[PDB]
Amino acid sequence: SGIVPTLQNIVATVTLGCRLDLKTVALHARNAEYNPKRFAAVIMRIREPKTTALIFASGKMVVTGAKSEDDSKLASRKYARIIQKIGFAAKFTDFKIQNIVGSCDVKFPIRLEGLAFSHGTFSSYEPELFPGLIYRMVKPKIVLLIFVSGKIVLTGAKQREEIYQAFEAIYPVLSEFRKM
DNA sequence: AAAAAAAAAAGGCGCGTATATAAAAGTTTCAATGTATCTATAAACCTTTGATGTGTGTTTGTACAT
Numbered sequence: 001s002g003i004v005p006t007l008q009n010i011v012a013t014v015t016l017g018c019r020l021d022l023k024t025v026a027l028h029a030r031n032a033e034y035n036p037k038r039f040a041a042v043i044m045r046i047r048e049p050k051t052t053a054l055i056f057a058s059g060k061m062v063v064t065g066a067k068s069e070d071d072s073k074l075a076s077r078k079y080a081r082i083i084q085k086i087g088f089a090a091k092f093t094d095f096k097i098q099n100i101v102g103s104c105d106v107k108f109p110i111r112l113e114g115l116a117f118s119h120g121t122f123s124s125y126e127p128e129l130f131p132g133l134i135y136r137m138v139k140p141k142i143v144l145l146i147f148v149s150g151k152i153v154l155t156g157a158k159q160r161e162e163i164y165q166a167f168e169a170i171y172p173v174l175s176e177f178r179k180m
Numbered sequence: 181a182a183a184a185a186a187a188a189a190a191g192g193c194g195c196g197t198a199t200a201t202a203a204a205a206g207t208t209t210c211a212a213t214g215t216a217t218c219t220a221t222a223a224a225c226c227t228t229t230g231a232t233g234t235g236t237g238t239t240t241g242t243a244c245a246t
Contacts, residue, residue, distance in 0.1 A: 013203060040205055040206090041204065055204095061204090062202080098201075098202045098203045099201040130197075130199070132199075143200055143201080145200075153200085155202090157201085158202085
């Protein structure tokens with residue numbers, strides 16, 4: 001392989017443990033996008049770490065755009081601190097990353113036609129809307145989006161580690177299906 | 181001939197085309213349930229019309245003044 005699956009989004013859940021006044025949360029924040037007509041969750045974008053989070057009336061926050069487990073975790077801790085400054089005793093309790101989506105590259109042109117045709121059972125293709133293949137692995141259970149540019153979009157894991165394992169499993173397939 | 185307002189016109193903002201990831205909230209759609217509202221329909225009445233025993237009626241025989 002020799003290629004790290006480069007994460008582009010990490011979505012995580014944080015139980016602040018309080019019924020947050022989403023109106024006051026929006027009011028006391030600096031740049032927060034909350035109005036009920038789209039969702040029941042204040043969405044805040046913090047530039048450091050730059051993450052976008054929706055926090056619900058349950059006080060549960062789901063965070064996206066992180067580049068690491070620690071980007072999301074530190075961002076969520078900052079989010080809880082911001083909520084506490086707002087006035088609600090937010091606390092980092094029973095945190096869990098619900099999604100780790102990444103894009104990386106293997107850089108060798110691929111016979112995507114070969115894979116999809118011979119892995120019709122596993123991968124399906126209708127190249128007249130979107131030129132990417134969809135592949136599944138159960139161990140680890142990662143779904144992977146493949147495009148001729150070599151871009152690999154690995155999704156379906158709470159951790160980047162399942163991303164890494166399925167990438168170490170799928171890059172050999174890619175090189176096998178490398179078009180030249 | 182000169183001043184002012186709208187259109188002619190394009191390129192790009194920015195997310196629909198996929199697009200899967202997952203939690204978080206909510207909607208709408210589907211089907212069983214409930215109900216007043218059609219209807220026929222045969223079972224209620226009212227009137228009709230053909231068949232009907234018989235009250236009244238033609239012969240028999242009568243006490244009864246005449």
